[PDB]
Structure formats: C-alpha cells, structure tokens
From a paper:
Previous studies have demonstrated that JAK2 JH2 binds ATP and possesses regulatory autophosphorylation activity on Ser523 and Tyr570. To gain insights on the compound binding modes to JAK2 JH2 and to analyze whether any differences could be observed between binding to WT and V617F, we determined the crystal structures of selected small molecules with JAK2 JH2 WT and V617F.
Phenylpyrazolo-pyrimidone compounds 34, 35, and 36, analogs of hit 13, engaged JAK2 JH2 domain with selectivity over JH1. The compounds that targeted JH2 domain shared a trifluoro-group as R1. Diaminotriazole analog 18, diaminotriazine compounds 4 and 24, and phenylpyrazolo-pyrimidone analogs 34 and 36 targeted JAK2 JH2 with selectivity over JH1, although the affinity of these compounds to JH2 domain was micromolar and thus lower compared to the JH1-targeting compounds 1 and 2. All compounds bind to the hinge via three hydrogen bonds (H-bonds) with the exception of 36, which makes only one hydrogen bond to the backbone amide nitrogen of Val629. Since the compound binding does not induce significant changes in the ATP pocket, we compared the regions around residue 617 and the helix Cα between WT and V617F structures. It has been noted before that compound binding to JAK2 JH2 V617F can disrupt the aromatic packing of F617-F595-F594 and the conformation of F595 and F594 can be reverted back to the JAK2 JH2 WT conformation. In structures complexed with 6, 36, and 16, a WT-like conformation for the phenylalanines was observed. This leucine forces both Phe594 and Phe595 to a new conformation. It appears to be possible to affect the conformation of the V617F region with small molecules, especially ones disturbing the position of the gatekeeper.
Author numbering: 536 to 809
The structure:
C-alpha cells in the first residue's frame, strides 16, 4: 500500500521529459517533516498518460515492488497523489537528473575512474536486488539519477540512485520492446515472459556501454527491423572508446541467459581492473 499525498499539498512545475506512456514533472510537496517542521520539498512527479489508463496496474506495481525495499542506491518513493482521476507517483527529486544526459553534457570532464565508481554503485544496487530476487527489468542510463557530483575538494565521488522500471515489458507493445533493443535482451524479444533476473544482467551490460560511451545510445542508427537483425545475427556491441570495461560489457551481454555472471562476480571484476 502506498502513502496518500493530498493534491492540495502538491504543486506541479516544469516538465522534465517523458517515459513510456508517462510524463515527468518537477514539483513541490508541502509536508510535515522531522520535529514537526513544515517543509516545501522538491519532488519528482510521474503522470500516467490518460490515454493509457489500461497500464495503471503495471505503472504502480513498478514503483510498489521497489518501495518495499530500502537501499542507499534506490530512489525513494513518497506515495501516490490520486489527484482526482489521475494516476500519479510522487518520488524523490534527484538533484542532477539522468545519468545519460549528464554523461553527454560532461563527456570531456569525466574519466574512467568516475565511470568505474558509478558502475560499481549500480552493480551494488543490482546485487542487492538479486539477493532479494527482485527483477527490475528496465536498467538503463536514463533511469539512473545523479544525487551528487564528484567533489575533489573532499574526495567525495559521484553518487547515483536507480529509479523504478516503469510499465513492465511483459505488458508493453512489441514495437516498444523492439525499440528498446539492446537494453531488452534477446530472449525477451523472443518472448517478454522470459523476463528473469538474467534480464537485468544483460541490461546492466548495455548500461555500462552507455556509461563508457559518454551518453551515446547503442545501435541508435538502427531502426527496429535492423535492431531485430542485430540479434538474429547474434552481434555484440562495439567496444566503447573507453574500452576498459568492454570485456565486462560483452560477458554481461551473453546471448545465453544462464551464463550471465552473478552481480557478485560482476562487482569482483569491477574491483579487479586496478
Ligand atoms: O529526480 C529526477 C530529477 C531529474 C532532473 C531533471 C532535470 C534536471 C535535474 C534533475 N530528472 C529525473 C527523471 C527523469 C526525467 C526525464 C527523463 C528521464 C528521467 C527521473 C525519473 F525518475 F523519471 F527517472 N527522476 N528525475
């Protein structure tokens, strides 16, 4: 069950972008906080499209399943608004936003050690999810959010959190899944019901490719039919320019799901690049 937040206590401000069948807004929540102090808290508001109310169950289940776990690398859910007839999630506002946009804007000021640290953090989150046998199912750089920048003065590294997967690929139209190649693994293009913990290992590889490519999108030049051929011919992504993690990427993006390494093994390999 989700906490109910009064429409009166929520103000919607700027549009930040779109998810699958969703609109994303920054907003403010008036709330009673610690010691009874009133706060006006920045929040991230996800609104399900009114034309896609058919997906409301999966929209809310995506956030609900992750809200029953607590972890430093997982975005906090605050509740739902209900907001009349609207379907709205209220979650933590992460100051610097999506990692994919951040990587692009700061491509020249981000070295391999920065990318390694963020990769280790993501793998930590995914290992926590694996230990809890919780499938995410939509790991990608768009869904990783940067809480804090590197601060060389105090030696603080960047710090990320993983947001919820949104509507599940087990219910999305096939065309959307094909557009999501190569984050959606080949067995899920074959059948979305093959969604498995092994799915997230494959998607983690694709996300690491994003992190190493300064925010490029793999296979973006390929339309959906060519993305299908990419899997039919069993291709692998090119090594990123920052090729230090190329081997780890391809080992995660194993066409055999049962052979993808555990996130424990992934974390050990990330720690071994030294
Ligand atoms: O907390 C935030 C904070 C910001 C954000 C956006 C712009 C500037 C600073 C922060 N942007 C997002 C998004 C987002 C927004 C548009 C497209 C993809 C992701 C998510 C979501 F949860 F949706 F992943 N949270 N978030």
């Amino acid at each position: 069950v989700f906490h109910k937040i009064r429409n009166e206590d929520l103000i919607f401000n700027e549009s930040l972008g779109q998810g699958t069948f969703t609109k994303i807004f920054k907003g403010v929540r008036r709330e009673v906080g610690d010691y009874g102090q009133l706060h006006e808290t920045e929040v991230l508001l996800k609104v399900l499209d009114k034309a896609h109310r058919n997906y409301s169950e999966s929209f809310f289940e995506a956030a609900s399943m992750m809200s029953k776990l607590s972890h430093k690398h997982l975005v906090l859910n605050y509740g739902v608004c209900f907001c009349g007839d609207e379907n709205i999630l209220v979650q933590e506002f992460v100051k610097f936003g999506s990692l994919d946009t951040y990587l692009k804007k700061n491509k020249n000021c981000i070295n391999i050690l920065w990318k390694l640290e963020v990769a280790k953090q993501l793998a930590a989150a995914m290992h926590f999810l694996e230990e809890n046998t919780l499938i995410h199912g939509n790991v990608c750089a768009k869904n990783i959010l940067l809480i804090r920048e590197e601060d060389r003065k105090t030696g603080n590294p960047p710090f990320i959190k993983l947001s919820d997967p949104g509507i599940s690929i087990t219910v999305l139209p096939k065309d959307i899944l094909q557009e999501r190649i190569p984050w959606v693994p080949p067995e899920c293009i074959e059948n979305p019901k093959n969604l498995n913990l092994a799915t997230d290992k494959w998607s983690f590889g694709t996300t690491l490719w994003e992190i190493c490519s300064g925010g490029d999108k793999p296979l973006s030049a390929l339309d959906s039919q060519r993305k299908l051929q990419f899997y039919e011919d069993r291709h692998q992504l090119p090594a990123p320019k920052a090729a230090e993690l190329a081997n780890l990427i391809n080992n995660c993006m194993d066409y055999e799901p049962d052979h993808r390494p555990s996130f424990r093994a992934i974390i050990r390999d990330l720690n071994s690049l030294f």
